[PDB]
Amino acid sequence: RRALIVLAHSERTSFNYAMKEAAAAALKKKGWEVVESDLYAMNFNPIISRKDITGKLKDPANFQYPAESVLAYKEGHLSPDIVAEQKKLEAADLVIFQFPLQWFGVPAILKGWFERVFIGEFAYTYAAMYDKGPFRSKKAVLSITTGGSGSMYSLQGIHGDMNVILWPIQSGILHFCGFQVLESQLTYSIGHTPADARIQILEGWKKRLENIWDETPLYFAPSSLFDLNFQAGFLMKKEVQDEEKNKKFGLSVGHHLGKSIPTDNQIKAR
Amino acid sequence: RRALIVLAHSERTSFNYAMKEAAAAALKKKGWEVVESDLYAMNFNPIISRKDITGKLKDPANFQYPAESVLAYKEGHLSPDIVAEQKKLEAADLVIFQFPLQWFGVPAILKGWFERVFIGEFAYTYAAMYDKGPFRSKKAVLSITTGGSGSMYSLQGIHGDMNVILWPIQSGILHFCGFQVLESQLTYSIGHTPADARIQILEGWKKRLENIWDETPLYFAPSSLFDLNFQAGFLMKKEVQDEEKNKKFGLSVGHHLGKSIPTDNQIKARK
Ligand SMILES: Cc1cc2nc3c(=O)[nH]c(=O)nc-3n(C[C@H](O)[C@H](O)[C@H](O)COP(=O)(O)OP(=O)(O)OC[C@H]3O[C@@H](n4cnc5c(N)ncnc54)[C@H](O)[C@@H]3O)c2cc1C
Ligand SMILES: Cc1cc2nc3c(=O)[nH]c(=O)nc-3n(C[C@H](O)[C@H](O)[C@H](O)COP(=O)(O)OP(=O)(O)OC[C@H]3O[C@@H](n4cnc5c(N)ncnc54)[C@H](O)[C@@H]3O)c2cc1C
Ligand SMILES: Nc1c(S(=O)(=O)O)cc(Nc2ccc(Nc3nc(Cl)nc(Nc4ccccc4S(=O)(=O)O)n3)c(S(=O)(=O)O)c2)c2c1C(=O)c1ccccc1C2=O
Ligand SMILES: Nc1c(S(=O)(=O)O)cc(Nc2ccc(Nc3nc(Cl)nc(Nc4ccccc4S(=O)(=O)O)n3)c(S(=O)(=O)O)c2)c2c1C(=O)c1ccccc1C2=O
């Protein structure tokens, strides 16, 4: 069992670093082979460019990134820092994303990590996406710390449902490539947590990773219910559309179908 | 009136760049003072660090960006790039974010732009946020070109409702700082769009800009319905919670209240 920890924070004194290192000690004691990826420490470049391709470009005039990136992968002409990361992606059974919440999403350095590493054919394919994604036998977690409390991200909060915020990350990025997303570890208002309570959070996180691989993941609508061709528009099957019309709740946050959204569908397991 | 355009594409030969240039010339046509912000061309730094503070750090031992960046702004110890961008904001009346949809969100360079430019005390404040935000006089628009199609992001699409994908950007980032978000300009299935069809998209976009200041912005639950208190935990007033009990719809995407979401809340204007 091998695991990969990705950390997007610039400081060592950060609670994210402490939250990272805690995961390491907890998993290593369980017999895990853990590798890390402090994005800031590596001086990782999150900005995609034509230099991501180390081979002869197919069209140096009109450059299209999703075209040259797929070709380079099949020929081994991606940037050496991207290939290095991809080797860790496949070798790792569990992937942990540790970061502070930043403007209702991941930090730029992490967003750019996704963009450069999740290259077509490697991470995803339209002939094998979501349920059939390359990373099927793999589980992903989100370990986030926010400045705001949990009430502010409640259904009756000022910012809105936190479930909505985590959707374009856990669904469209993680699950899209086959990943099984587990229940996110949410840390609301960490800047306002008493000293001896912070110490407890580290323990609840370390105890969790003792039996995390046997957890029940979040629910997504399986693609077995979609047409999955380019002429139908990848829409849902009418056999199912007529079935889901008698229900009160939608399938998921993005697959709500103009009706009620399942409580904590993106934070709590089904 | 002044307009700011923030372009996020590495390629000059991209349709996003065409969409930027066409938007520029259309505004200058109507006597707009147009300022541009080509991130890739500006070699903009998208990563936050203590390097963002040129002065002396309050605590180089235990460094915290949010609490340390607010200080530099107050005293004027911010990086020249950040300040040069913060001035373009304040000056302009209309902000346009031109970018390709990348992984169900914005490019890192644009995300980093938000992270370094939008600093506390300037862009936002716990007392002055959303409806009472600092940028409550200004308007913002999203101009997006996606790979997938409109049906893929339809309600029954494999990807899901675009309104959900657009919410954390428009509500959590734009509106949070006071902005008035207009109807996003979505260009689906680009690359599968014919040449003569791509020349018409530009003109229609240039036409919309003619009377875009007189458009209706997207709906967001007014902060008046909430108790802006920490003892109340910034929740909806019980007076308001008892009003929205006999209803079968929420107020927005993030304020669905476990109920239904108003159709096209993040793409189509109110009513
Ligand atoms: C650009 C930007 C955008 C942001 N956007 C958002 C947003 O949209 N929403 C939002 O809610 N927040 C936002 N934030 C705030 C951000 O979420 C918080 O700053 C972050 O979650 C906490 O930072 P940190 O995890 O590095 O911990 P720090 O703030 O560095 O540390 C928190 C506390 O943990 C303590 N600590 C450190 N190490 C240990 C240890 N080993 N044991 C015990 N205690 C320890 C420290 O004493 C410190 O007081 C944003 C911040 C930035 C910079
Ligand atoms: C890292 C990454 C993540 C992505 N994530 C997503 C995602 O989550 N969802 C999604 O849907 N898509 C995604 N995409 C795909 C992305 O949305 C498209 O590649 C992008 O929208 C293409 O837009 P462009 O500005 O590059 O235009 P281009 O694709 O460069 O332009 C297309 C065509 O327009 C023509 N053209 C250019 N200028 C003009 C002009 N002035 N007049 C007429 N024709 C012109 C060009 O000749 C070209 O053939 C992603 C891509 C990347 C690289
Ligand atoms: N850095 C923070 C922080 S912090 O904890 O690190 O200071 C916190 C933080 N949210 C956040 C901000 C303030 C407070 N609380 C807060 N704030 C002030 Cl200025 N005064 C008081 N005192 C106060 C005043 C009157 C009544 C009661 C009280 S109380 O102390 O008992 O809560 N409380 C609380 S809470 O946990 O106490 O509810 C969360 C944020 C951020 C952000 O950086 C940020 C960035 C972008 C968007 C949003 C945020 C953001 O929200
Ligand atoms: N880069 C691409 C590209 S590429 O053009 O740049 O090579 C292309 C591309 N896909 C992509 C690009 C163009 C179309 N356009 C396309 N094609 C056909 Cl055969 N028919 C129609 N008709 C059509 C026209 C308008 C509206 C709806 C429809 S409908 O077919 O969905 O009913 N449109 C269609 S389709 O789903 O509608 O078939 C997918 C994607 C991506 C992505 O990067 C990407 C990333 C994450 C998730 C998804 C994608 C992605 O889908």
Author numbering:
A (entry chain A): 4 to 273
B (entry chain B): 4 to 274
Provide excerpts from the study.
To analyze these putative structural differences, we solved the X-ray crystal structure of NQO1 P187S (for data collection and refinement statistics). Initial crystallization attempts were successful in the presence of an equimolar concentration of Cibacron blue and excess dicoumarol. These crystals diffracted to 2.7 Å and showed a structural topology that was almost identical to that of the NQO1 crystal structure, with an rmsd of 0.33 Å for 249 Cα atoms. The same was true for the region around the amino acid exchange site, where no significant structural differences between NQO1 and NQO1 P187S were observed. Although our spectroscopic and kinetic measurements have documented the effects of the proline to serine exchange on catalytic function, the determined crystal structure of NQO1 P187S is almost identical to NQO1, and hence does not provide a structure-based explanation for the lower enzymatic activity. However, we noticed that crystallization of NQO1 P187S was much slower than that of NQO1 (weeks rather than days), suggesting that NQO1 P187S might be present in a less ordered state in solution. Cibacron blue and dicoumarol are both competitive inhibitors of NADH, indicating that occupation of the NADH-binding pocket stabilizes the C-terminus and thus prevents proteolysis during crystallization. Overall, contrasting structural evidence from X-ray crystallography and NMR spectroscopy led us to assume that both disordered and structured conformations of NQO1 P187S exist simultaneously.
NAD(P)H:quinone oxidoreductase 1 (NQO1; EC 1.6.99.2) is a dimeric (61.7 kDa) human cytosolic FAD-dependent enzyme catalyzing the two-electron reduction of intracellular quinones to hydroquinones. NQO1 is an essential component of the antioxidant defense system, preventing the formation of potentially harmful semiquinone radicals.
